[PDB]
Amino acid sequence: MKASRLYTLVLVLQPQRVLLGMKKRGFGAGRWNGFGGKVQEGETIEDGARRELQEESGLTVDALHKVGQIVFEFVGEPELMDVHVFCTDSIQGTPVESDEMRPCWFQLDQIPFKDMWPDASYWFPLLLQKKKFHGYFKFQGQDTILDYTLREVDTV
Ligand code: NA
Numbered sequence: 001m002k003a004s005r006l007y008t009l010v011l012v013l014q015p016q017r018v019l020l021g022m023k024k025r026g027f028g029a030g031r032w033n034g035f036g037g038k039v040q041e042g043e044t045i046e047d048g049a050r051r052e053l054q055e056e057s058g059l060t061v062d063a064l065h066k067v068g069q070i071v072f073e074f075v076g077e078p079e080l081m082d083v084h085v086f087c088t089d090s091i092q093g094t095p096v097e098s099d100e101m102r103p104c105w106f107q108l109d110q111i112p113f114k115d116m117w118p119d120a121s122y123w124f125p126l127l128l129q130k131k132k133f134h135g136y137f138k139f140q141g142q143d144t145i146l147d148y149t150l151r152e153v154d155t156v
Contacts, residue, residue, distance in 0.1 A: 004071065004082040006039035008049035010064065011127060012057070012088045012095075016108055020116070021056055021101045028142065032116045035101070036083070049086045057103045058096030063089045066156045067127055070119065070135040075146070087127065118143060122150050132156050 011034045012019035020032040035056040039048035046064055054060050068085035095103035106112055108128065113121050119137040126133045131152050138147040 002073075002078055002080050004080040006045065006048075007036055007081055007083045008039060008045060008052055009034040009036040009070075009083050009085045010049050010053045010088065011067075011085070011124075012053075012059065012091060013127065014091075017105045018108060018111065019057065019059075019095055019103055019105055020112070021103045022115075024098075024100055024102055030115070032104075032106075032112050033120070034085070035103075039084075045084045046086065049084065053088075056098070056101045058098075059088075059091050059093055061088050061091060065089060066132075068123060068133040068135065069156055070123060070133075070137065072119075073136070073138040075138070075140045085123075085127070085133075118145055119148065122148065126150075126152060 021035050022032050023029045035053045036049060037052045039045055049064055050061055064086035066084065067087050070083045070085060072081040072083065097103065111124065123133050123135050133150060134153050135150045136148060137145055140146055
């Protein structure tokens, strides 16, 4: 069996648009994603998600709602990524670009799937329908899915 490391992913989903962030630097730059990163010792998963949202997008929110969980496995990496996915309840500030991340709004008929992680084409439609989900994706490198599962659930 494998070990897993905890990560968060936050989607700022409004009725007609979604905020995504483009990774600006380093390996893996050039794709759009939600905001997030590793959970730190002691903080709850939700508080880690709020923290990463503020660091990467500038937005400060009091509460999130958990919508999904996605496990990622990469060929050659024994550690799994256990990603807890949240959506914002409400926002009340503007997103800010950093040297690491550029936030941008997309209309919900212009979701930039071809420039997102390949897995997002599978679970993001569920998120848009306000459904909850569990997913698993095995990748060869950054682009190729070798195996995956996706299931709508009633409780995350
Ligand atoms: Na991050």
